[PDB]
Amino acid sequence: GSNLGMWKASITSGEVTEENGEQLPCYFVMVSLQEVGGVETKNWTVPRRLSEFQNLHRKLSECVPSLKKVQLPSLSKLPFKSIDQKFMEKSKNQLNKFLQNLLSDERLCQSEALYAFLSPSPDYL
Numbered sequence: 001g002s003n004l005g006m007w008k009a010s011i012t013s014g015e016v017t018e019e020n021g022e023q024l025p026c027y028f029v030m031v032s033l034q035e036v037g038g039v040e041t042k043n044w045t046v047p048r049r050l051s052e053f054q055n056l057h058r059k060l061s062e063c064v065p066s067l068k069k070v071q072l073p074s075l076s077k078l079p080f081k082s083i084d085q086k087f088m089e090k091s092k093n094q095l096n097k098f099l100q101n102l103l104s105d106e107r108l109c110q111s112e113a114l115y116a117f118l119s120p121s122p123d124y125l
Contacts, residue, residue: 025050031118046120059113
């Protein structure tokens, strides 16, 4: 089964990537799992796209309605509507705290949706 329990996630830096001639917002997420004293605590960082963040909120919202109260940032796939520093920060603040709400809820804490998002999965949905 899944050996979860206490997971810590947070953003450290943010950058914008490029794909198919389009720029998308990317926010690095540092996940740390403190296992039994016998094992050493693990810690890694993985880039998370805005779209991914929302995908999780939807999956989590189903398990917890309270989460529905939380609102995440968004953007458009327009040529002029590019990602700027202003949004990179304004959104980062919403994402940084967004994760906290997930680890703050015991229901979500065990929710696979979290462990899956916290894990290094670029194809996450």
